[PDB]
Amino acid sequence: SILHQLFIVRFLGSMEVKSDDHPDVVYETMRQILAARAIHNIFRMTESHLLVTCDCLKLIDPQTQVTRLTFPLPCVVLYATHQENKRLFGFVLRTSLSSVCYIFESNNEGEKICDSVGLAKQIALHAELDR
């Protein structure tokens, strides 16, 4: 068995954040981004397919199938959907110090995405501990 799950997502925005350690960073970033977009009359959104593997997270263009961005799973230090709106998903990418929080919208699959990532990290950890 292998992990290869695709989810439709739409990118909302990103912000550099402090290298903290709590899910609140995501929630606070989701709010500040949604606020900035609306205050400045922004409605547009880029739709992609988020692919989750035990090695990374990738954002793919639906029709062309071209990978626009790839994030090493071990650098995805925080990720969460909003408890009050499972349509929202976000994660923090920490490079080896420096952190950026990415916010997305999904077709009500916020929880599914997080479970997928968690499971992906478990598979990667298994491989790490195995001979």
Side-chain angles (χ1 to χ4, degrees), residues 118-130:
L119 221 176
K121 282 166 170 293
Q122 299 190 206
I123 297 179
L125 182 60
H126 177 85
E128 175 191 58
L129 304 170
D130 172 50

Side-chain angles (χ1 to χ4, degrees), residues 24-83:
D24 285 352
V25 182
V26 177
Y27 304 147
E28 287 167 346
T29 302
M30 290 175 163
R31 184 214 76 74
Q32 195 171 325
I33 288 299
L34 288 162
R37 286 169 66 78
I39 285 168
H40 296 286
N41 206 202
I42 299 181
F43 286 78
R44 177 195 174 187
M45 292 180 273
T46 305
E47 191 168 83
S48 306
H49 283 178
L50 174 62
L51 180 272
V52 180
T53 65
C54 61
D55 298 313
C56 63
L57 262 43
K58 291 185 181 179
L59 284 300
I60 302 165
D61 182 83
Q63 199 51 55
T64 62
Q65 288 295 301
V66 170
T67 303
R68 61 215 317 161
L69 297 163
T70 61
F71 309 84
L73 201 52
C75 294
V76 180
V77 64
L78 290 170
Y79 56 90
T81 170
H82 200 286
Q83 51 195 56

Side-chain angles (χ1 to χ4, degrees), residues 13 23 26-27 29-30 57 76 78-82 87-93 100-105 110 113-114:
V26 177
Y27 304 147
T29 302
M30 290 175 163
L57 262 43
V76 180
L78 290 170
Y79 56 90
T81 170
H82 200 286
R87 303 270 177 182
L88 300 169
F89 170 68
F91 65 84
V92 173
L93 193 75
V100 175
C101 184
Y102 297 81
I103 309 302
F104 302 83
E105 157 179 303
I113 295 175
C114 290

